[PDB]
Amino acid sequence: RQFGPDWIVA
Amino acid sequence: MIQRTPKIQVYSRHPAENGKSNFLNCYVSGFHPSDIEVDLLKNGERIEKVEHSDLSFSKDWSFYLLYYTEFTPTEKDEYACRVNHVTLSQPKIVKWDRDM
Amino acid sequence: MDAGVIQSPRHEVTEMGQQVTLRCKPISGHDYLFWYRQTMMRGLELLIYFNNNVPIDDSGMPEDRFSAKMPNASFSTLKIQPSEPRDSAVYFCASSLWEKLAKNIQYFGAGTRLSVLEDLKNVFPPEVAVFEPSEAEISHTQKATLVCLATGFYPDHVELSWWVNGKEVHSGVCTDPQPLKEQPALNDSRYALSSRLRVSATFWQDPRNHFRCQVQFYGLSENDEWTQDRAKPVTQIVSAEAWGRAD
């Protein structure tokens, strides 16, 4: 199971 | 930009026995960037329905892929893997040796 | 300061069978956009959200007649076609950023209040009347309460305000939080609303002072057809008024 909901942009 | 050429091993899934069904593998690894062309050859000719694994990568970020197809080794058929990649001035061909 | 989320239209009153378009401009720089609706029956619910203009979760979208797009980072649309009375709701747009969402913050627009009606002949603007202070109240309290009554309107898209000497006032004002129904029995009952404005007796008794109860009503627009007898019940202002007087 993935980290989420999602990622901050770089 | 850092480019790394691929390492290549060509080998069978099971110990090869003439006339007996098996899988031919070409494992490419250690390369960057990820775009790469890999064909398996039978007596010099591309084999048509080759599959490959999903792109992944190692601790150093370099990529790796396994290309493979079912085949039946014989005494006289020659198999090889041919790889092209930006690092290569010409496609590299590696012959299958049933003891490596 | 900078704009917050801007939605349009603020109000829409329309006949079923037509296409409705709700629009949203998110705060510039925000890369998430949410559409919600809120109804008496089903409460507050997410329809869809977008990240970088792409729909991420549309599990709350109705399965037919609703479509949401984000053609660029500054603009989103939600369309309903053909519209039906059950689509009536307040629709809210919000925008946010990852670092705000990680603290559960999002920024809401003001809403679009949508009424989709079976039949436009049920639409009526308000009649408006003002009632002047009781002589007794003045004498007992030294204060003076005006009452404004907005009656007979449908649907209930009204905004009532008090104006004294042609400037809008807030102090001393109390307006019902909800309209009431003239025939509670009846579906599609018209509505009524009251407000009060209270001032010092002395201020009411000055004949130089002018009061006005104002009601903005949202109704039919130019595109809607109207053939009835009576005047087309368009979006409009209706007001009533009174002058101060010493005795």
Add this chain to the structure above:
Amino acid sequence: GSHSMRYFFTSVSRPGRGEPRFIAVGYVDDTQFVRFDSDAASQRMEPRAPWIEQEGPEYWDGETRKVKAHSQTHRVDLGTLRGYYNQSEAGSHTVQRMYGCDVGSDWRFLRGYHQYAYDGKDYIALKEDLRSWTAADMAAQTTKHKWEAAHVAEQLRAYLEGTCVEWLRRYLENGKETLQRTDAPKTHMTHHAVSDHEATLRCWALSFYPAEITLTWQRDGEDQTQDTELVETRPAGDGTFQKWAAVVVPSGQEQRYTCHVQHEGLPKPLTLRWEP
């Protein structure tokens, strides 16, 4: 022993096409279990091991939503880093993210990690304390400031210490048959004359799992590195691995040499000898 769950996310810029190519894969230990490819038709996360197939639709909808959202942030990051490095819009570039968690043989949390690379070189990483970042250069410093201000490490540390390690344990159990197996290496030796004065002995390990293995040559009970070579461990394609180690010896002395094999699937290290 230890176990790990790791996710890998690669995006490659393609100027002149509509969008980058984005490929994600998940692994438990050496076993792949999911994939996503932005260019494929399904537009879903897909199973790649039998034991995740039992996960229900809520699992699959969520995993697919997360991986698709991750493809969009990779796409933005390619544009951002291009700008940071003032690079042409004409070139193809790569972003890579990996993260995961390990448990010990007791199955408790051992560590978590998260690393990000641009064009195949370290860009920014989470330190082992899971609270702080290391940045490779000034561009990455701009990112790091952004991630500190947003409290990214706190989110990530909560996942790595909780959810990541919980679902890893869930998978180890549901896939116990294949994931908690050990396949001992099948082992043989080969001999070829190379030079009139010399020959190669090649010690083979086949069909083993997990991939970790050590092969060493000794001469008279004494470790050898000279005129030895070890191939990189390689997948057989059926869930198992292969490796060999060779030594060239003066011919006539084959019996001085011995090949030693250690693998978790062996109660005791094996010794092999050439038997003509």
Add this chain to the structure above:
Amino acid sequence: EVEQDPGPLSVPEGAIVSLNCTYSNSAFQYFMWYRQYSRKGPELLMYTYSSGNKEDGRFTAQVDKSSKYISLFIRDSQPSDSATYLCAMRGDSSYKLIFGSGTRLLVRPDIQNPDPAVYQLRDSKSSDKSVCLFTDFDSQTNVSQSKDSDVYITDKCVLDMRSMDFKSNSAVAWSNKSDFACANAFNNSIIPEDTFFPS
């Protein structure tokens, strides 16, 4: 899915108020509360990640993930807290929130010098109504509908004459008919015995 009692809750100014929601899905991990004023959008108050307790001024939000029960406490309740309170929650696979249906809270103002009166207002020459205003009654009083068709009564509303710290309650009644008198107007209501009728 989240259960929330609709209320309405009516409390006197100064009271502690307790709001709660219950949920079923153990995947929820983020729990929030909002206030919404009538005809406006929702405003975030408090947010909690772990099963646990957070204070901010007069507000305390709590979550118990074992009982699947979340609550919000408001200390020293004020008239301006009068609003609908909604809880919302999500997991970590999506930013989609699931909201409870809301609880309406009315915080009744404390009126320091009640002077309950019922007045007749100079009804309009444009308006077939009589208007009766029941005003200056304390917040212990509640108001009720007419017993019939023809007579309309608005619930109590509170005005703030900002500038002289002064508040008053009012409710309004009207009807076209001949029967209608201010003495008769508010008959369905428990009103103060000392309410002032005038001539």
